[PDB]
Amino acid sequence: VVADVVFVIEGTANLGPYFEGLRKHYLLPAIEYFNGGPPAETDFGGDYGGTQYSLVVFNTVDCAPESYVQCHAPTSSAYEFVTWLDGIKFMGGGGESCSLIAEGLSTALQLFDDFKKMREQIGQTHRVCLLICNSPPYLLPAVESTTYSGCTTENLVQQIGERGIHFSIVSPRKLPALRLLFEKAAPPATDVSQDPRHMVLVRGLVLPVG
């Protein structure tokens, strides 16, 4: 069915080694579920009706004069999305444990606002957001965003949870903060983890049970 899919990925050294495994087990099947059957080179962008994928990659504060979030424009090709998922290079990090989840979520919110101004042929669609993270959030409010500046991760994930965006978390290391954020993004009113170590909670989307 029509879907506005937004992936939010932590592009840091953590999630570096574990990303290839996560893609085969969880991310790639999730794209197929939105796009029935695996994509191969015939899928064309430009159908404004239909499922539209997008990436948001974020970083920590060690990329000091560079920007924090790299966003990609929406595509209707699942194949271009797969090439974008290959094209991420995980180079960041340093002496820290946290990352800028608030930035990635705020730009995901701006993506969903631009999607909502885009699709008017349908009032509401399946608005799905995934967060592929390996790290607890920073305590910084969001700085490099307009209309969602000065907001912590809890406020932004409340605004994700209300208005009916289906929020999911795929993490290769089981963590408390990520679980708390997932519990908070509750939509108004099954073991999918193939590996025991992986923590995967999916509010929306169907992934083969393992």
Positions that interact with other proteins (CB under 8 A): 36-37, 40-42, 44-50
Measured distance CA(153)–CA(103) in Å, rounded: 9
Find the DSSP H helices in the chain: 19-22, 28-34, 78-87, 101-118, 153-161, 176-184
Measured distance CA(35)–CA(77) in Å, rounded: 9
Closest separation in Å from C-beta 9 to other proteins: 27
Comparing CB distances to other proteins, the nearer of 41 and 191 is 41
Closest separation in Å from C-beta 181 to other proteins: 35
- Angle, helices 101-118 vs 153-161, to 10°: value is 30
C-beta separation of 48 from 103 below 8 A: no
Comparing CB distances to other proteins, the nearer of 89 and 117 is 117
Closest separation in Å from C-beta 194 to other proteins: 25
Comparing CB distances to other proteins, the nearer of 40 and 139 is 40
Measured distance CA(170)–CA(179) in Å, rounded: 10
Closest separation in Å from C-beta 174 to other proteins: 36
Comparing CB distances to other proteins, the nearer of 37 and 176 is 37
